[PDB]
Design a protein around this ligand. Sequence first.
Ligand code: ZN
Ligand code: ZN
Lengths: 138, 114, 53, 50
Amino acid sequence: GPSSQNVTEYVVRVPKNTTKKYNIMAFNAADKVNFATWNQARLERDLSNKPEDQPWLLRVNGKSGRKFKGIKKGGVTENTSYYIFTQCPDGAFEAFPVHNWYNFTPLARHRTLTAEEAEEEWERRNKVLNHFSIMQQR
Amino acid sequence: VGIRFCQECNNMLYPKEDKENRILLYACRNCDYQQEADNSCIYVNKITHEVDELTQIIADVSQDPTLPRTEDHPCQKCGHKEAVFFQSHSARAEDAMRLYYVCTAPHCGHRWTE
Amino acid sequence: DEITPDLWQEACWIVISSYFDEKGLVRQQLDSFDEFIQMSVQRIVEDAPPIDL
Amino acid sequence: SDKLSLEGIVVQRAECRPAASENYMRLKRLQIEESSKPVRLSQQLDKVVT
Ligand SMILES: [Zn+2]
Ligand SMILES: [Zn+2]
């Protein structure tokens, strides 16, 4: 059929100045996230610094949904480049350079052990028992 | 035997048992996720020599210039009449000076002992 | 074409002679010092942070 | 306008390599020469500075 020997050739275009920036994004293979549930999102800079040189902090669906934190890529694009071919109705690819590579990681929302009480329980170096009871008291 | 993690917080699963049903449950000791085991194994230990080096040698070892070559032990699968033989040098045995043969043909590398 | 077995000795020594004609016996000292003066000193000076006052 | 949108997902990865093998090493040499233009190394003076 036509699909067996399909022939495709589209023109590539590179704009010089673009008012909106691009960045590569990639979740971990084991995250197993869904995008339909992401009804609301809040992508704001972290408050731990106290601006452009700080990480972001993704907060999905307020406190109901999961939160994520990540860092910029250590490597620099001195020799490498990343281009994205955006689909358009006219069919001409529009290669777009990127500015940064980002990698957020999953975080679990639950009662977390605090540093001070961690020090308090550190006396039980290996004498600790009933791992549930560690969190039950807190 | 067999290690896998829960899908919620991606931490190490741990064995557990329940009194109501008396069934093994690999539950996450961190979060509140539970699942039914399918192997009934917890801790398998191997004291004697069960290393199975035959499946541990990397097949690309044949193309090392420093290893000997022989023509008296042809490959079983592809039938090539050249092979590279070497010993183990792994701890936990410190014995068994036996030869492991690897075929030197490209797109091959069947490992066999003799 | 090929180094004959009975011309090998002379040949190999010729090679060795050329080596010692070009490198010398104390080449490691001089080469290391040349590396130090040419690039290590300049790299050290440039790497030092600017004096802010 | 601080509006976040997702263009899409990458479906295939591509690697571009030059067809040339030997002559492309000359271009690599030129690139290395250009990269070594601004690196600085100490000079030598014929006469003492006064
Ligand atoms: Zn868990
Ligand atoms: Zn073979």
